[PDB]
């Protein structure tokens, strides 16, 4: 069985943009990270109601987030389709995805070595601790970290983890879209691209199966998604939350 057809014209074509607006939207070197408001680490060895008090890593953790959404914007308008979709669809999109591409895209900094997000430094190291700094817990970081871990197992080729995020934007199932039928029509397009490429390009491969766990993770992502969304809406009850916040967050996960 096993038909394995060439990338077409337009395939190579979309791979190539969704590689280059990802060369401009992700730096590598993390070299604007010196603009956030400063990393704050105080002892937290424990403890909810410290946490909550502190929110030490908040700001700068919050500054980063609200930095990649906006990385995240310029990727997802740099999808081929993209455009075509009205600019309110465009927007439903963003907001309900930007939480999950983040945690897609952030894969690449993070690091099985120790587990943690390595973007520099030690000052740019972010673990476990510094996220329960920024008030989440363990029912989210938990989870994000397995996600991870098993997103760093699938190996994927830069062209698959580009597919991936732009598939992972592009969704019609999600609350609000009004032209699902475009959506999906932009999302198969993209589908059948990463189809096609892993057919093409990964070796063995009897292991055609790499595409059914990339799907499985886009699920994995709609429920750390749903479970940082509720952890978010509490955090914003901590008065003075906002302040630590910036207007896009406030927007993007209000
Ligand atoms: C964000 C990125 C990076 C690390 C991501 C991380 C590490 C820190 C904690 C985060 C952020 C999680 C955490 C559960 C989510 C949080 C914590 C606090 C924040 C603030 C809004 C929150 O809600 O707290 C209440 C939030 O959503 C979700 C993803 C986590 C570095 C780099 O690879 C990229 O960045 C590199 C730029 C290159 O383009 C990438 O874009």
Redesign the pocket.
């Known amino acids: 069985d096993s038909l394995r057809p060439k990338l077409s014209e337009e395939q190579q074509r979309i791979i190539a943009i969704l590689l280059d607006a990802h060369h401009k ?4 070197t ?1 070299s ?1 990270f010196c603009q956030f408001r400063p990393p704050v680490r105080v002892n937290d060895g424990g403890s909810v109601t410290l946490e909550l008090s502190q929110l030490s890593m ?1 700001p700068h ?2 500054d ?5 959404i906006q ?1 995240v914007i310029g990727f997802a308008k740099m999808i081929p389709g993209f455009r075509d979709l009205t600019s309110e669809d465009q927007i439903v999109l963003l907001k309900s995805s930007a ?1 999950e591409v ?2 897609l ?6 690091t099985m070595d120790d587990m943690s ?1 390595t ?1 520099g430094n030690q000052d740019y190291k ?1 673990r476990v601790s ?2 329960t700094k ?3 817990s363990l029912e ?2 938990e989870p ?1 970290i397995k996600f991870q871990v098993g997103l760093k197992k699938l190996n994927l080729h830069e062209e698959e983890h580009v597919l991936l995020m732009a598939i992972c934007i592009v969704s019609p199932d999600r609350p609000g879209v009004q032209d699902a039928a475009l959506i999906e029509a932009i999302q198969d397009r993209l589908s059948n691209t990463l189809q096609t490429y892993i057919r093409c390009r990964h070796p063995p491969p009897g292991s055609h199966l790499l595409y059914a766990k990339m799907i499985q993770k886009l699920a994995d992502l709609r429920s750390l998604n749903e479970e ?1 969304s509720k ?2 809406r509490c ?1 914003s009850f901590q008065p003075e939350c906002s302040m630590k ?1 910036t207007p896009l ?1 406030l927007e993007v ?1 209000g």
């Open positions: 939207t992700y730096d590598p993390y604007d908040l953790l919050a980063l987030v609200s930095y990649s990385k939480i983040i945690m895209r952030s894969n690449e900094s993070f997000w973007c972010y510094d996220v920024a008030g989440h989210l970081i994000l940082h952890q978010y955090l916040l967050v996960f």
